[PDB]
Design a protein around this nucleic acid. Structure first.
Ligand SMILES: [Mg+2]
Ligand SMILES: [Mg+2]
Ligand SMILES: [Mg+2]
Ligand SMILES: [Mg+2]
Ligand SMILES: [Mg+2]
Ligand SMILES: [Mg+2]
Ligand SMILES: [Mg+2]
Ligand SMILES: [Mg+2]
Ligand SMILES: [Mg+2]
Ligand SMILES: [Mg+2]
Ligand SMILES: [Mg+2]
Ligand SMILES: [Mg+2]
Ligand SMILES: [Mg+2]
Ligand SMILES: [Mg+2]
Ligand SMILES: [Mg+2]
Ligand SMILES: [Mg+2]
Ligand SMILES: [Mg+2]
Ligand SMILES: [Mg+2]
Lengths: 103, 180, 201, 125, 86, 207, 128
RNA sequence: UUUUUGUUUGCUAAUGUAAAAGAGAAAUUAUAUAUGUACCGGUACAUAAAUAAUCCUAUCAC
RNA sequence: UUGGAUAAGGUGCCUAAAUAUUCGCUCAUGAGAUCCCAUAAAAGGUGUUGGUUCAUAUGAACUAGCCCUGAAAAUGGAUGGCGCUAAAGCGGAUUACCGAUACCAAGCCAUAAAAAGAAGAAAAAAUUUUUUUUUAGAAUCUUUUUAUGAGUAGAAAAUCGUGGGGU
RNA sequence: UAAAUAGUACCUGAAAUCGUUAAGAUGGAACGGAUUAAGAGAGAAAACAAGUAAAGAGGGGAAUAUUCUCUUCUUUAUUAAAAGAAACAUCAGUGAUUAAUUUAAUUUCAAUAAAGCAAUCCCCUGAAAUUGUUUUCACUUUCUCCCCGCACUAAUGUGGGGAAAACUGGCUUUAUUUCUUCAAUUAUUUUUUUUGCUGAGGAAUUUUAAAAUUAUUUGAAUUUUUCUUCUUAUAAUUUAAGUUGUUUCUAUACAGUACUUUCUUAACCCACUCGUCUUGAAAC
C-alpha cells in the first residue's frame, strides 16, 4: 500500500435541478455506500474536494482542486447537495469527488 | 411507534343541540359516533348529518361535547360488520361489508380503501351507518369465516420488503423468492 | 456504480425495468456490459409482444426507409434501443452514456470470466405474479426474424460445461483453503485466535 | 455572477449587449432597449439577453470606486492636480489622453510629490 | 436608529428578559421543576391511582352508556328494516 | 472568567482587538469592542491519552496518541516519534478522529500517567509558533535544490524552541516506548496507518 | 358575527383556527413586528424593546409584549388597538408542507382551506 | 524490449484523458425451490436459503 | 443576489424527487394512465370483483367497479418518449421527498414616504515623541428607517450623446 | 521626401466583402442567455513591505554665497505593518438535523408473586326479553381426555360428536415498578446531538440607558433551590450594543504556469426571425 484513502468515494452528478432549470450553486453528490437520508446526514458537514487534472501546469503541477462543504442531504436516497467555493463545471458530471473525513 | 403504518382515522363521540329559542327553550340533544381523521372533521361530519336528518345547521346549534373514543382492547382481533350508504356515478346503494381488525378505526380505514379500490367510491360519497362487532357465529362473509378457522396456519408467500439500506440495485447472486 | 465495469447477467430480468436501471447508472457514469440478452423477459404474453413489435416494424419512414426507425432485432440490440429510449441521447452527455453501454448475446471473451451481477429490482421472479404471461425476448426476436437463436443456445450450452469444470476446481481450492485454515488456526497465538473467533473468521 | 473583491460588490461583470447584436453587424452591441411587440427580450423569456435594470446598481458607498478603492479623477494640467493634495487617498489621477509626453512626465512627477496614485503612468513610456 | 440584526427573542436570553421582565422567574421555576428526581414522581403515581378510581369508574359508566345507546339504535334500525321487509 | 446564561457556563478567554476599522465621519477605531471571547470547548471524546488518527497533514493516517489540550484550543499529539514517526505535533481537534482506545486504560502503561501529564504540562502553546526571524532566514535561501532543503532543515534544527520541543519529545519517548513495545499488537497498531477500504462504510463505523 | 360572515365570504382562500397561548406567544416573539410612526406612515419594526410599544399603547395600559400577548389570547378591552398595532404576520411556508390548498380541510380527501379550529396551531408551528 | 530525462519560416523537442486511489471478486439454476455428490431424467444423502448484511486483499519500512 | 421552506405538480428512466410504504381492483389477439385536452355512445358480456333482493349451497334475478365487445381512414407514430402488468395502470390511505421570479431571513439598487439634521480627536504603528490614515455638514444635500419594485398604448422625470453659440 | 502602406485611382482610409497566417471547433444550421471550466492573450493603478541605514544621480524650499531642511529616481540590506483568501474557533441571525424533557389532560397500559373468583365462564363482545336496570345462553384456551372416521389432515396430525381443566385469558384483591412497563395525542415547559448559509454597519453621547452575566453588599419572598427570585449599592464583562479573533498562504513577489481581466472554445440547462398590423405571429 503506497498512499492512503481517508475519504469516502463519490460521484459528482448534476446540479440541483428542476425538470429543466439548472441552479448551479449546488451540486448533487452520490456517496458510495450511503443509501438513505439518515446515513447521508452523517456526512453533512464534511468537506468535499473535486480534484482534477489539466494539461498545462499551474502552481508547477497538473492537478488542481475545488473545495466544497456538503451542505445538506438531498431526498431519501442518500444523495447529498454540496456547495463549492467556485461552482463546479458540468464537464465534471460523471466524475469522482473525494469527501474527506475532516471536521 | 410506527408512523409509516398508521391510518389516522379516529372515532369521535359528538354531542350537540339546536340553540334554545324562546319558543323551544329545552330542545333535543343528538349524539353520534363519527369516524373522522381529526376532531374538526368529525364536528363537520356531525353537522352535516344533523342537517341531513333534522332541521339543524351549525349556525343555529352548538356542540356540547366532542370526546374521542380510543379502542379499549386495541390488540384483540375482532370481526367488524359495517353498513354503508354510498353513491356511485349512476346512483345510490346500501351495502354491508365485514372486516377482521384490531379496532373500529382500523376497520374503517380498511373499508375506505376497499370502497375506493373495488367500487371507485371516494370518501366524500360514503356514509358509514353503524359498525358493530359480529361474534363469529353470525359472520356471513367467506373471507372472514376462513380466518375464524380453528388452528389457523399459512406460509409466507409475500416477497421481502428489504430496508432501503440493504436494497442495493446490483446483486452478487440471484435472490430467491422461495426462502423456505 | 463505483466499479469500473459492471457486467449484468440479463437472464431472468424484465426488459424495461432492467433498461431503466441501466440507464440511470450510465448517466451517472458507469460502463455496463449487459450480457446474455437472449434471455431477457418481457411482461406481456409472447403473441402480444410480437404484435407490439410488428406494429413498431410497420412504422418506417414513408419517403425513404434507409433513414427512419431502424428495426434492430437482435435481442441485445433491442435492449440497447430500449436503454437509449431512457437517455437524453441527443445531447453529448447522453451520447457518452449510450456509448458506455455494451450489450452481448450469450457471453464472450472477457465476460465469461468477469463476475456477473444481477439487478433484483428488475427480476421477473420478483416483479410478475406467477399466474401472469411473460415472454423470453430471444424467442420473440426469433419470431421477428433474428435467426441466430439456436446457435446462441448451443454456444451457451458449450460455455456451461466449461463453467462447471471451472467451478469444480474452484470448489476444490476453497475446500483446500478451509482445511489449511483449520490446520493453521491451531498454530497462531491463543489471544489472536480467540479474537478471530469472536469476529467470525 | 457577483464579483466580490473586498468590500466592492459588483453584481454583473458581463456587459448588457444589444439584443441580436450578435446576429447582424448593423446592430451594435451598445445596449438599446427593445421596444416593439413580440420582442422576447422585452417580455423577458428565459434564455434571452437580460435587460439592464436599476436592481443591478452598485452600493451607494462604493459606487464609482475602482479596484483601488479610489475615485478616478481625470487630469489635464498641473493646476488641476492641486484639488487632490487634500484627498490623495480617496482619488487617483488619470492623465488625459491628449496630454503631451513632456507634460505627462511633469504631471507624473507632481503626482509622486503628492503621493497620489496615477492609473496610467506608462503612457508614452 | 440604525437597524441592527433583530435579536431572536425566544432564545437570546437577554433580549427575552428585556421583552418580558417576569420571564426570568418563570424560567427559574421551570428549572426547579425539572430538577426534582424520579423517585418522588414514581411515588406520586400510586397516589394518583388511588385518587383516580372513582373517576375511572365514572368514565367507564359514561362510555358504557354511549355503547349501550349505540347498540339500542342499531337494534331499532334492524327492527325498522324487518318491518319494511314485511 | 465565565458566564452562565441559560445553564451553559461558557468560559471566557481574554482576546486582543487587532483590526482597526474606518470610523463614520472622523478617524479610525478598533473593530472589536468585545474583550473576552468564549473558549473553544472540545467534544466529549478528546481526552488526555487517546489514540487518534491525523487526517490531513504530511503524517496522513498515522495513528498518534494525544498529549496536551493546549489552552488555545487545538491540541498536542505524539506518535512517540521513535515508535511511529509522528513528532511532537500541534493539531486541531477537527483534523483528528480520536478513537475509543486509550493508552492509559492498558494495565501495563496506565501507571506511567503522572509523569506523562507533567511532561505535557511542560509543553506550551508558543513553543510551536515559529518566530519571524527564522522564517526570514529560511526565505533567504531562495536567492540549487537538495542543498536548499538541507539548509532549511538545518535552520529548523537551530531554533531554540524547536530544540526544546525535540528534547521534550525524546523524554516522552523514553518514558513511554518500552511498555508500548512490550504490548506488541498495540505497538503495531500505533505504527500502522489508518485506511478506509471497501467494506468500511464510514457512516456505520463507531471508531 | 360580522367577522364570521366576512370569513365565510373568504373561506376558500384562507385557513384559520383558534391559536392557543403558546403559539400566540411564539408568533409575537419570533414573528411579531409592529407599526411605528405617525398615522398612515408606519414602518414595520420588530419589537425587541418594550419602549417601541409602550409609546403607542401606553394610554390603554399595555406596556410590553406580554400584555399584548394576553390581550390577543383573550380578546380583552384593548384587543382591537393591539391587533392594529401588529403588522400582519409575514409567515414562512410550512416546513413539511400543505396537504392541498385547492380542497377544504373538512373534505374527506386531503385539503386546507377550512376552519381547522384547533389544528391551526400545528400549522403555525410548522410555518413559523 | 529495457533504461534515462522530459512534454513547466507556421512549427521542426514533446500531453492528453467523461473519469485510479483495493475502481478486488468468472458456477449454474429455479423462483410453489435450487445446487452438488454417488448410483440407475429417476433414487438416496449432503449443501445454500437478509445469498457482496459476504469473502478476498492491504500497513509487518529498509 | 445568497440561503431557507413551500406552491401547482410530481418522485422507474428521460427528469430534480419513492422501483417508498399500505389496502383493494384490473391482463386487454390494437390495456390504461391525471382539469382545460385534444374524443367515444346505445347495447351487450356464464370475464373477474364486490354487493342487493329473493327462493330452495345450489338456483334466480338484478346492481356497479375494473376489463372486454360495440371501436373503421387514408405519410409512420405517438399515456410526451422509452417502457410498465408483486405497475411505472385505475381508486384510496400513509409518510418522506423534489419543486418557482410566489413565501421567509439577510444583503445591495432605485422609488416613495418617514425620522432628523445649518463643530469634535479616534485608532494603530513605531520609539515620552514622531509617522500613518481620516478629523464630515454640498438642503433637488447628508445620515438613518420602513415599505414597495410586472407592464404594451400612453404620460412624466432624471440622465446620456451629436452640430453650433456666449461664458 | 520628414513620411511613398503620401506614388498622381495619391489626406484620413470605417463597414459590408475578400486574402494570408495562426489558434480553435466541426454527426442535418449557426449564433445566443445563465454557469463554470479549459485554453490563449493582455495586465500591477488594492492584488505585500511604509520607513531607517550606507552613497550615487538629480531637483526644490527656507535660514543669515552656504549652512540647514524637504524630497524623486537608482542602488546594496533592513525591519515593518496592512491587504485579501483560506482554515479553524467565538458570537449573532436564519435554517436543517436526532435525541429528548417538565407539569397537567385525555375510559391507556404492561409486567412482578403471593392470595383468590366463575366455567361457554369472565374484561369485553354478541343474539333475544325513551334511558337506566333485572334475567336468558352465546362467546375462552389447549402440546388435556373420550368416542366415531381409523391416518381419514395443508399441518409434527386431522373431519365430526362429546368431555376435562383453568396452565391460557379475564376479573377480584394485597403490596411492587431498573425483571419489564409507564403509550399515543394534545396542552404547558426546558434542553440537546451534529450542522449549512449570512456578517450589513462602524453610533462627537440612544453601541447610551436598561436587560443579561460574574464577583461582592442590604433587605424580603415560598417555587428551600451551586441558574431560587426580586432589590440597596459597587465594579467589571456579553448572552446587550448586526463578527471577532488565532494560524497559515499569497510572499520576503514586481508578473510566472499563481492572482485579476478579456477573448476563444467546450460542457449542463435554457433559448423560435426581428420589425409590424393583429383578439392572436416562430408562422404556411
Ligand atoms: Mg402581443
Ligand atoms: Mg402536496
Ligand atoms: Mg381555482
Ligand atoms: Mg432561492
Ligand atoms: Mg423541500
Ligand atoms: Mg432521478
Ligand atoms: Mg412516471
Ligand atoms: Mg416598472
Ligand atoms: Mg515630425
Ligand atoms: Mg498609413
Ligand atoms: Mg492634410
Ligand atoms: Mg489614401
Ligand atoms: Mg451530409
Ligand atoms: Mg387463572
Ligand atoms: Mg462589517
Ligand atoms: Mg429548448
Ligand atoms: Mg385577423
Ligand atoms: Mg413577430
Amino acid at each position: 500500500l503506497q498512499a492512503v484513502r481517508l475519504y469516502e468515494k463519490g460521484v459528482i452528478l448534476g446540479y440541483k435541478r428542476s425538470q429543466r432549470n439548472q441552479d448551479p450553486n449546488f451540486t448533487l453528490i452520490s456517496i458510495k455506500n450511503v443509501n438513505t437520508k439518515k446515513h447521508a446526514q452523517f456526512y453533512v458537514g464534511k468537506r468535499v474536494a473535486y480534484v482534477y487534472r489539466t494539461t498545462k501546469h499551474h502552481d508547477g503541477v497538473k492537478i488542481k482542486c475545488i473545495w466544497g462543504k456538503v451542505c445538506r442531504t438531498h431526498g431519501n436516497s442518500g444523495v447529498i447537495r454540496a456547495k463549492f467555493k467556485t461552482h463546479i463545471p458540468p464537464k465534471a458530471f460523471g466524475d469522482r469527488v473525494r469527501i474527506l473525513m475532516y471536521p | 411507534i410506527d408512523n409509516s403504518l398508521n391510518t389516522n382515522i379516529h372515532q369521535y363521540h359528538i354531542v350537540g343541540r339546536a340553540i334554545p329559542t324562546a319558543k323551544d327553550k329545552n330542545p333535543n340533544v343528538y349524539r353520534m359516533c363519527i369516524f373522522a381523521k381529526n376532531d374538526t372533521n368529525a364536528k363537520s361530519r356531525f353537522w352535516y348529518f344533523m342537517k341531513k336528518i333534522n332541521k339543524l345547521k351549525k349556525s343555529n346549534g352548538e356542540l356540547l361535547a366532542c370526546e374521542q373514543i380510543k379502542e379499549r382492547f386495541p390488540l384483540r382481533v375482532k370481526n367488524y360488520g359495517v353498513l354503508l350508504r354510498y353513491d356511485s356515478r349512476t346512483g345510490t346503494h346500501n351495502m354491508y361489508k365485514e372486516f377482521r381488525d384490531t379496532t373500529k378505526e382500523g376497520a374503517i380505514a380498511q373499508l375506505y380503501s376497499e370502497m375506493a379500490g373495488r367500487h371507485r367510491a371516494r370518501a366524500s360519497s360514503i356514509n358509514i351507518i353503524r359498525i358493530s362487532e359480529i361474534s363469529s357465529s353470525l359472520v356471513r362473509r367467506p373471507h372472514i369465516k376462513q380466518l375464524l378457522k380453528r388452528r389457523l396456519r399459512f406460509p409466507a408467500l409475500h416477497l421481502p420488503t428489504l430496508q432501503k439500506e440493504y436494497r442495493k440495485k446490483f446483486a452478487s447472486k440471484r435472490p430467491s423468492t422461495y426462502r423456505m | 456504480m463505483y466499479k469500473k465495469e459492471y457486467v449484468i447477467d440479463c437472464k431472468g430480468h424484465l426488459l424495461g425495468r432492467l433498461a431503466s436501471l441501466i440507464a440511470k447508472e450510465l448517466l451517472n457514469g458507469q460502463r455496463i456490459v449487459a450480457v446474455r440478452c437472449e434471455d431477457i423477459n418481457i411482461s406481456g404474453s409472447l403473441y402480444r409482444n410480437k404484435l407490439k413489435y410488428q406494429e413498431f416494424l410497420r412504422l418506417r419512414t414513408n419517403t425513404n426507409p434507409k433513414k427512419g426507425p431502424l428495426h434492430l432485432r437482435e435481442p441485445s440490440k433491442i435492449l440497447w434501443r430500449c436503454v437509449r429510449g431512457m437517455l437524453p441521447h441527443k445531447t453529448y452527455k447522453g451520447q457518452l452514456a449510450l456509448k458506455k453501454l455494451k450489450v452481448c448475446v450469450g457471453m464472450p471473451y472477457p465476460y465469461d470470466k468477469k463476475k456477473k451481477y444481477v439487478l433484483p429490482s428488475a427480476l421477473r421472479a420478483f416483479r410478475l405474479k406467477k399466474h401472469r404471461r411473460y415472454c423470453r425476448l430471444g424467442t420473440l426476436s426469433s419470431r421477428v426474424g433474428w435467426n441466430y437463436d439456436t446457435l446462441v443456445k448451443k454456444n451457451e450450452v458449450l460455455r456451461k460445461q466449461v463453467s462447471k469444470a471451472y467451478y469444480k476446481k474452484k470448489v476444490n481450492n476453497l475446500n483446500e483453503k478451509k482445511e489449511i485454515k483449520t490446520e493453521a488456526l491451531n498454530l497462531i497465538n491463543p489471544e489472536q485466535r480467540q479474537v478471530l473467533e469472536n469476529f467470525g473468521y | 455572477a457577483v464579483k466580490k473583491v473586498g468590500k466592492i460588490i459588483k453584481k454583473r461583470t458581463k456587459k448588457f449587449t444589444r439584443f441580436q447584436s450578435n446576429r447582424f453587424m448593423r446592430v451594435k452591441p451598445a445596449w438599446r432597449k427593445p421596444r416593439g411587440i413580440d420582442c422576447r427580450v422585452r417580455r423577458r423569456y428565459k434564455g434571452t439577453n437580460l435587460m439592464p435594470s436599476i436592481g443591478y446598481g452598485s452600493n451607494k458607498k462604493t459606487k464609482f470606486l475602482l479596484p483601488n478603492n479610489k475615485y478616478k479623477y481625470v487630469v489635464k494640467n498641473v493646476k488641476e492636480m492641486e484639488p487632490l493634495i487634500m484627498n490623495h487617498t480617496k482619488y487617483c489621477v488619470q492623465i488625459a489622453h491628449n496630454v503631451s509626453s513632456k507634460k505627462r512626465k511633469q504631471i507624473i512627477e507632481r503626482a509622486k510629490q503628492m503621493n497620489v496614485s496615477v492609473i496610467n503612468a506608462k503612457a508614452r513610456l | 436608529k440604525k437597524r441592527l440584526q433583530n435579536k431572536n427573542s425566544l432564545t437570546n436570553f437577554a433580549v427575552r428578559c428585556r421583552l418580558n421582565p417576569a420571564y426570568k422567574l418563570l424560567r427559574s421555576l421551570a428549572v426547579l421543576r425539572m430538577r426534582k428526581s424520579i423517585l418522588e414522581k414514581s411515588k406520586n403515581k400510586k397516589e394518583k391511582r388511588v385518587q383516580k378510581q372513582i373517576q375511572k369508574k365514572e368514565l367507564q359508566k359514561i362510555n358504557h352508556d354511549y355503547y349501550k345507546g349505540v347498540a339500542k339504535a342499531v337494534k331499532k334500525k334492524k327492527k325498522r328494516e324487518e318491518k319494511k321487509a314485511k | 472568567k465565565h458566564y452562565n446564561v441559560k445553564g451553559k457556563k461558557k468560559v471566557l478567554v481574554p482576546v486582543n482587538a487587532k483590526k482597526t476599522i474606518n470610523k463614520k465621519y472622523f478617524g479610525r477605531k478598533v473593530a472589536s469592542k468585545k474583550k473576552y471571547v468564549v473558549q473553544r470547548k472540545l467534544r466529549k471524546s478528546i481526552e488526555v491519552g487517546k489514540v487518534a488518527i491525523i487526517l490531513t497533514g504530511k503524517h496522513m493516517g498515522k495513528r498518534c496518541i494525544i498529549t496536551k489540550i493546549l489552552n488555545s484550543g487545538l491540541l498536542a499529539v505524539v506518535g512517540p516519534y521513535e515508535i511511529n514517526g509522528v513528532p511532537l505535533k500541534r493539531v486541531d481537534s477537527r483534523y483528528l478522529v480520536v478513537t475509543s482506545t486509550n493508552i492509559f486504560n492498558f494495565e501495563n502503561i496506565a501507571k506511567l500517567k503522572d509523569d506523562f501529564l507533567n511532561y505535557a504540562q511542560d509543553i506550551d502553546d508558543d513553543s510551536f509558533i515559529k518566530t519571524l526571524e527564522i522564517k526570514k532566514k529560511q526565505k533567504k535561501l531562495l536567492k540549487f535544490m537538495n542543498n536548499v532543503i538541507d539548509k532549511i532543515k538545518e535552520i529548523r534544527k537551530e531554533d531554540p524552541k524547536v530544540q526544546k520541543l525535540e528534547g521534550i519529545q525524546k523524554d516522552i519517548g523514553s518514558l513511554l516506548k518500552p511498555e508500548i513495545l512490550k504490548n506488541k499488537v498495540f505497538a503495531h497498531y500505533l505504527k500502522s496507518k489508518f485506511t478506509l477500504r471497501n467494506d468500511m462504510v464510514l457512516h456505520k463505523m463507531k471508531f | 358575527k360580522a367577522t364570521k360572515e366576512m370569513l365565510k365570504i373568504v373561506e376558500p382562500y384562507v385557513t384559520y383556527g383558534y391559536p392557543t397561548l403558546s403559539t400566540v406567544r411564539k408568533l409575537l416573539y419570533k414573528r411579531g413586528y409592529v407599526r411605528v410612526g405617525k398615522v398612515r406612515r408606519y414602518a414595520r419594526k420588530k419589537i425587541q424593546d418594550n419602549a417601541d410599544i409602550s409609546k403607542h399603547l401606553g394610554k390603554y395600559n399595555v406596556h410590553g409584549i406580554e400584555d399584548m400577548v394576553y390581550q390577543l389570547y383573550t380578546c380583552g378591552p384593548v384587543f382591537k388597538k393591539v391587533n392594529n398595532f401588529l403588522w400582519a404576520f409575514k409567515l414562512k411556508p410550512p416546513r413539511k408542507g400543505f396537504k392541498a390548498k385547492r380542497h377544504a380541510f373538512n373534505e374527506p380527501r386531503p385539503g386546507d382551506w377550512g376552519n381547522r379550529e384547533a389544528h391551526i396551531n400545528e400549522l403555525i408551528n410548522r410555518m413559523i
